[PDB]
Amino acid sequence: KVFGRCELAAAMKRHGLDNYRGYSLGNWVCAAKFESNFNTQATNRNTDGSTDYGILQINSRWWCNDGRTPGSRNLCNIPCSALLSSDITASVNCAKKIVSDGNGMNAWVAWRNRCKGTDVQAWIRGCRL
Ligand SMILES: CC(=O)N[C@@H]1[C@@H](O)[C@H](O[C@@H]2O[C@H](CO)[C@@H](O[C@@H]3O[C@H](CO)[C@@H](O)[C@H](O)[C@H]3NC(C)=O)[C@H](O)[C@H]2NC(C)=O)[C@@H](CO)O[C@H]1O
Ligand SMILES: [Cl-]
Numbered sequence: 053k054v055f056g057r058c059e060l061a062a063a064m065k066r067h068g069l070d071n072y073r074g075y076s077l078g079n080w081v082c083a084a085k086f087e088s089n090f091n092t093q094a095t096n097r098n099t100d101g102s103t104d105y106g107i108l109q110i111n112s113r114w115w116c117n118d119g120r121t122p123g124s125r126n127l128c129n130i131p132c133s134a135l136l137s138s139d140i141t142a143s144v145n146c147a148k149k150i151v152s153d154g155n156g157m158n159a160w161v162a163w164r165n166r167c168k169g170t171d172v173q174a175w176i177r178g179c180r181l
């Protein structure tokens with residue numbers, strides 16, 4: 053599923069991401085935009101053999117099991133394919149654990165390089181929230 057911008061904003065708010073660990077909703081929408089282009093089915097292989105999955109590009113070295121990332125963990129206790137669903141529940145629940153793990157939203161490379169320190173509120177302009 054390719055979400056609309058305000059559609060995804062509404063979904064993340066309902067699932068409790070707006071100001072989760074202090075990160076306003078626009079941060080999460082900006083992260084999703086540049087990680088996946090709002091596409092729940094996005095996948096991308098990394099040089100270390102791991103793969104990033106879903107709307108928030110959650111990585112199989114740490115967070116989910118995809119059966120092909122040796123020596124990895126599965127800290128969200130979830131198959132990585134669950135992160136590709138049109139229902140973003142699994143991705144949001146896992147994202148809450150990632151952002152709580154010490155480095156905040158710096159765990160998302162695209163967030164650090166393209167959202168951090170910008171006017172992220174613009175990502176929820178015009179949305180009925
Ligand atoms: C969205 C996503 O999947 N991002 C991936 C990053 O999570 C991952 O970075 C590494 O993440 C782990 C887990 O959070 C980091 O380990 C944690 O480090 C903190 C700070 O030192 C420490 O307090 C925690 O105890 C420790 N947790 C565990 C379970 O060990 C690790 O430092 C990150 N590595 C970095 C930032 O280089 C990166 C790299 O695999 O991939 C992203 O896609
Ligand atoms: Cl915001």
Ligand SMILES: [Cl-]
Pocket residue numbers: 073074155156157
């Ligand atoms: Cl933080």
Ligand code: NA
Pocket residue numbers: 112113114115116117118121124125126
């Ligand atoms: Na894994």
